[PDB]
């Protein structure tokens, strides 16, 4: 049987379960594991983001040492739109307005002069004793201050604890953000995790009644088996089998392992995309589909350049 | 600079050619293998990654009659692109359906 595009467009549908900021559960119905895993792998490792690459330290008197603090700072998500920037070329130590961002972190811990009152907590004894992510100040280079409104280029989370100081200690450094894909380094990955699972279909091969219905309700996840008193006696039925986690606990009950059938619905996926905050997750899934279209267009242009 | 190498067999038939796709892994390879195996005029198709140290895949296509194995490769690329375009349209329409139903049911 050939590839019928019309049959695919009849049987394919997307059902959105829940979408807030930084999470998205949806369904893909009637697509194969090859393409669904392609989308999952693009979301993991090939949708580009902006992340700190070079850290120019000037003074670092903290105990969080320098090459550790650089890696520390590279793992912070930078809330930029990566589609407005470009790849820095091979060998450019100095990036321009097109392809880099700058952040200055300059925090000095001093002792709180007044209002200490011989206490013990560090929040009263010291000032700037914890270096958070709100201390990172964006340094616009070129015309980036006019291109981006104020408060747009920033880290995603302010209150990620970078380091921790004591009086006298100082962190003075400058960060350069570049664009890359998560195949290169995991700091560029835009998702917390992106994954899928096929939808389970639990069916009852035999009517289950009485205390066996309560055992059946407890051998599954809370919610899939609705045990209900129709006559006063209890019968069990499957109600929303999406909740089941395949603990397969019903296969340990010797009597009731013959009345159910756990399988999966073929080609019915449940994706979950959890953005770190760089882009909204529906935008991440759109860009992840466009990446695979770009791969196909890349090799079609290679074939047309050979011909 | 060249991403695609077409390696014909020792026979000059052009019906059994290995495609070497540089800077590529299981994503495009497995999706293309799925879409090329849908072609009735394809005898054999599989991909493999050569070594973990390298970043490329070998992709074999063997056709049956007189068509070269460049035509199923190009047709599989176009069909996978059309698949992804339709998935993009369905996904964006469903997300827009969610954002309109949600913003009006709380008001």
């Amino acid at each position: 049987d050939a590839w019928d595009q019309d049959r695919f467009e009849k049987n394919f549908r997307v059902d959105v379960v829940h979408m807030d900021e930084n999470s998205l559960e949806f369904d893909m119905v009637g697509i194969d594991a090859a393409i669904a895993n392609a989308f999952r792998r693009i979301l993991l490792a090939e949708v580009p983001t902006m992340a700190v690459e070079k850290v120019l330290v000037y003074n670092n008197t903290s105990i969080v040492q320098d090459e550790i603090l650089a890696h520390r700072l590279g793992l912070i998500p930078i809330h930029a739109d990566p589609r407005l920037f470009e790849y820095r070329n091979q060998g450019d130590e100095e990036g321009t307005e097109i392809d880099t961002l700058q952040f200055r972190l300059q925090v000095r811990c001093t002792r709180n002069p007044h209002a200490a009152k011989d206490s013990s907590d560090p929040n009263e004894l010291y000032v700037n004793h914890k270096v958070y992510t709100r201390h990172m100040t964006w340094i616009p280079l070129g015309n980036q201050a006019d291109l981006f409104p104020e408060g747009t280029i920033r880290p995603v989370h302010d209150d990620i604890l970078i380091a921790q100081l004591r009086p006298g200690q100082e962190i003075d450094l400058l960060m350069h953000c570049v664009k890359g894909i998560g195949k290169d380094h995991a700091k560029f990955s835009p998702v917390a995790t992106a994954s899928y699972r096929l939808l389970p279909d639990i069916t009852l091969l035999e009517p289950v009644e009485g205390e066996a219905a309560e055992e059946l309700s407890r051998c599954f996840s809370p919610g899939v088996i609705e045990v209900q008193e129709v006559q006063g006696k209890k019968v069990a039925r499957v109600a929303n089998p999406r909740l089941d986690t395949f603990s397969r606990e019903i296969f340990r009950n010797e009597k009731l392992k013959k009345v159910v059938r756990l399988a999966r619905v073929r080609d019915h996926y449940i994706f979950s995309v959890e953005s770190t905050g760089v882009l909204p997750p529906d935008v991440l899934v759109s860009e992840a589909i466009k990446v695979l279209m770009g791969k196909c267009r890349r090799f079609l242009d290679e074939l047309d350049a050979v011909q | 600079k060249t991403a695609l190498e077409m390696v014909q067999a020792a026979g000059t038939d052009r019906h059994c050619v290995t495609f070497v796709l540089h800077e590529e892994d299981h994503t495009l390879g497995n999706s293309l293998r799925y879409m090329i195996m849908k072609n009735p005029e394809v005898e054999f198709c599989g991909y493999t990654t050569t070594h973990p140290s390298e970043s490329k895949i070998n992709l074999r296509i063997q056709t049956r009659g007189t068509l070269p194995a460049v035509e199923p490769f190009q047709r599989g690329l176009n069909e996978l692109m059309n698949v992804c375009q339709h998935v993009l349209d369905k996904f964006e329409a469903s997300i827009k359906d969610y954002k309109d139903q949600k913003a009006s049911r709380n008001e």
């Binding site: 059902d15 959105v16 559960e25 | 139903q101 949600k102």
Partner: peptide, 8 residues
């Protein structure tokens, strides 16, 4: 783990 909002 929830009934989908967008219908078939």
């Amino acid at each position: 783990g929830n009934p989908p909002v967008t219908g078939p």
